[PDB]
């Protein structure tokens, strides 16, 4: 988040989103123009979105129910086996990789 110091010794994931919001505030707000900080409204929403993921969880949720209902309606002929997915990209398994790609 806003600190800039993450779990691995590298920087926090939502630090770019926070630095952009502070940069926006200092570079738009002032006493001369109080309402310049309305420029920060989308920037402040992105910082919260990076933090809690409510908007992205709502997008995937709608997309995932839409995707699955199309899969059931979709015509099915032959499902790849688990072992066939494992074979994709190997040294001498050209037959399986082709089957995975329907080619």
């Amino acid at each position: 988040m806003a600190s800039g110091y993450g779990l691995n010794g590298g920087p926090s994931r939502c630090f770019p989103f926070w630095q952009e919001l502070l940069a926006c505030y200092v570079t738009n707000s002032s006493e001369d123009n109080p309402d310049g900080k309305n420029k920060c409204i989308p920037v402040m929403e992105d910082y919260y979105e990076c933090l809690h993921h409510r908007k992205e969880a709502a997008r995937v949720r709608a997309l995932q129910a839409a995707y699955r209902e199309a899969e059931a309606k979709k015509l099915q002929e032959n499902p790849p086996t688990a072992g066939q997915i494992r074979n994709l990209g190997l040294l001498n398994k050209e037959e399986d990789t082709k089957k995975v790609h329907c080619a």
């Binding site: 779990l7 994931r13 770019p16 997915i85 994709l88 995975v100 790609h101």
Partner: protein
């Protein structure tokens, strides 16, 4: 997907969708971890400018450089396939001896110095490629050019000499 290390992963998701015809296609690097570490100093001896150009491109497009530096990335991949092929047309016994040693030694360079010295000499006399590590102390001999390794589980044979280019045997 997130850079967080998973604690309860039980499933892998794969996408069989290919990159669109618009983006040029680059064949990916086929070397494994042991061959890539054995040739890493050679990567940077030839590909440093492109390796450094792709990183400065991404820093010039903060938050967006994945999409906006795809050509510099294609260039680094090509530069790196060039050295690999070069290390394969020449010096292939030496290259294999080094990275096959590295896999049995936790991929620790100090545990395979005799195979590194043999390969480094063969890469130097067929590619003009030298191993250079920046900011090593000048008071002491470089660690990769040292006869005795203190952390090596097996002592280095007295008859195995480090490879210093230029000076003869």
């Amino acid at each position: 997907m997130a850079t967080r290390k998973p604690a309860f992963n039980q499933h892998v998701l794969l996408d069989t969708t290919p990159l669109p015809d618009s983006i040029p296609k680059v064949k990916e690097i086929g070397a494994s971890s042991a061959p890539l570490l054995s040739a890493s100093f050679f990567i940077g001896a030839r590909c440093k400018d492109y390796n450094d150009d792709y990183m400065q491109c991404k820093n010039e497009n903060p938050g967006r450089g994945e999409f906006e530096c795809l050509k510099e990335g294609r260039r680094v991949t090509r530069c790196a396939r060039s050295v690999l092929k070069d290390i394969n047309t020449h010096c292939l016994e030496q290259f294999r001896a080094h990275w096959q040693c590295l896999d049995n030694n936790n991929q620790q360079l100090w545990q395979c110095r005799p195979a590194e010295w043999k390969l480094n000499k063969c890469v130097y006399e067929n590619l003009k490629l030298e191993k250079v590590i920046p900011d090593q102390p000048k008071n002491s001999t470089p660690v990769h050019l040292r006869q005795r390794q203190i952390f090596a589980h097996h002592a280095i044979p007295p008859w195995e000499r480090p490879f210093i280019p230029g000076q003869p045997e």
